[PDB]
Amino acid sequence: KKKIRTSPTFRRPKTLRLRRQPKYPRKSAPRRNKLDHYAIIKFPLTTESAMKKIEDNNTLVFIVDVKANKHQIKQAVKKLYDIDVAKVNTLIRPDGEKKAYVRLAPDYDALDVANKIGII
Amino acid sequence: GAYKYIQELWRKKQSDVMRFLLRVRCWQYRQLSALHRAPRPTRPDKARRLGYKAKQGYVIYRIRVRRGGRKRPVPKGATYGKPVHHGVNQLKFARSLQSVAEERAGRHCGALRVLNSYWVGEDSTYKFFEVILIDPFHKAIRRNPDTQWITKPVHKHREMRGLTSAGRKSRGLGKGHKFHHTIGGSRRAAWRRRNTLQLHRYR
Amino acid sequence: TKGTSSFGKRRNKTHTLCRRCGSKAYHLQKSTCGKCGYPAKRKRKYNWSAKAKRRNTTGTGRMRHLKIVYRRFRHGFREGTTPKPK
Amino acid sequence: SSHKTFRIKRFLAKKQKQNRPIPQWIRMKTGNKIRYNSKRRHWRRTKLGL
């Protein structure tokens, strides 16, 4: 009274949990983004079935890093080639690295983008 | 001083004043876990004539040890070969219960140094000890001589190498005609010296 | 039949590659490695096999860190110094 | 099998990049003592541990 135990169980009461505020950072600097835009795209493919897909299917094809996802590939082509991307399909080859079929918008076409890159 | 009266009262363990305390504490210590920090020494005079000071960095742990002998870990009592080694039940372990109470305190508290330990009451089933632990990295200990010897890496896990007060009594080392077994530092050092064949250059 | 016709029923892996030490001895149902003993913290090592200890001891790998310490030992483990520029 | 985990597929990728002949210009270096690939593996004869 006037406190009342309307339960047969003693539960542990909740206490004040407060956030950290350390006297020093454990690491001196944030680590550098070592998978940047130039580390996504390694080299394009210039095979006979890659040039056959640039013509008829309106899409580029690169060899990307194995760590990258379909969102980083869509942003790295958008940055260092100044072209817009509709969708990206990816596969990992039996060689070991990952192939990316980046499809352009219907505005652009890959035949006058591969001229600027120089793979043609 | 009033430590001289506590020293004589703990020599009266069968008196009606002291058998009452050693039963109400043994009841209290039985209802807790086997590893349990005490907030202060139960015996404040026995602790301090074994190296305890009331400074920061000296902690006390209460250890509960099952008493009795050492039953041999063999499946269904079958120790094969030569009936001299058919003994299973009436076997005794080489270290004492206080030596295996210090070892269970320092294995759980790996970041602490086991100084020494004392007795706080037994049972018929259990036996309770309190162990004096030292934190070797506190500035109240490392900035003090006569106690910074334990902050040296040669004193790590001294309860497991058998160099505390209770762990050393089971080694058989001392001066005398009785202690000829360990007359080179240990029983293994004396065995290795009298079983090497010294082969000089000139025989 | 215990001979040739019972080898044809073997199509179920018992072991696979382990995360620690990489040998193909990680037992799938026991959830343990038969080579390094990994679910566990301490590394499996026995003295009844002298040959099996000189196959995964210190030195048989790269020693990416200890070859630098063995070099840094020869100058007293010096740190934060610059070799007297021109 | 067509159903495979990523770290066994990466295992199989390494062991066909090193299932390769020796280059033609290795055999003209100073102090050669190597003429073919002594650890080259065929899929039919000698299988992989995995």
Next chain:
Amino acid sequence: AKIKARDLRGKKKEELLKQLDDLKVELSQLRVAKVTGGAASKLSKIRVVRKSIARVLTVINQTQKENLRKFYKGKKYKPLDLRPKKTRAMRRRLNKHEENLKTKKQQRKERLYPLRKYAVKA
């Protein structure tokens, strides 16, 4: 046209990263020519650009690190990569100041009974 690391240590990060990221453009254009056959003069220059990126990033990572060695110059707590590395066993031992601490009873026998110097004639 070789960039050298001591030619770079006076130029700030607003013009190092401008000088860095167009080497990475230059490296990406060379790997384009590596898979189109290209030219042997443009294949030997891959290593010249790969080490040019490694040299600029070394000057950046060293200008940055010494500016954090001096931001924490004289503070109570430093980050773990700025405090010394030497050896784990050497970081646990007592320091220069508390190995030569002695009790007042220890430094009284040092001053009452010092070790003398003495020759003995024959």
Next chain:
RNA sequence: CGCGACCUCAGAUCAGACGUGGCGACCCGCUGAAUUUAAGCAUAUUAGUCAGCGGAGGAGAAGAAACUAACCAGGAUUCCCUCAGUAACGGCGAGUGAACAGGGAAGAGCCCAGCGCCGAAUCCCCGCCCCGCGGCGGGGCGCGGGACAUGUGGCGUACGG
């Protein structure tokens, strides 16, 4: 039926630290066989050894007598030479087996609790002004927190104080 003081416990991605694992020739603590020998074999022997487990260090362990000795006495511990294949142990069978003194290699001693006096005299932390860094300390402070009379520091230890 509140407010407090403590005591005993608890929570936290609290502030700052520390332990884990490897190697393992040497070292310490445990655990611990059987082949073998006895012309069989069970005590014994192999052997407190192999295998198993834990913990170290550049050495470790031991170490300043609850000692040896019975002398006209020696004087920490470790190592070597000798004692000595001896005293002793043993189906007194096979086998096992030290130590003291002596000669050398090194050579070093010390500290508590207690008993006592000394307004806790002591220590830890965090801010602070002044000097260094390069294993982060001294000097001063703060009617600034805390440990602490359930005993910190100084003197003092069996050779007496």
Next chain:
RNA sequence: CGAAGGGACGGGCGAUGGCCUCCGUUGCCCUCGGCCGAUCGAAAGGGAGUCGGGUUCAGAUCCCCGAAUCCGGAGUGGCG
């Protein structure tokens, strides 16, 4: 043989950052509470929603073309 829930629109005391008229948050107080056992375990069990035509030397219910569909998000409302 454990003080094993760190959650909850709401209620509200509010420190209050603002398109401070409020309105998205925020900490604590009063209020309510067993997925009562961390976690792992099925490419044949349970498990929302893709099909037709065309296309390659080798890939497709995955690529093109054409028809759909599910789940989640919509505070600044996207209109009825």
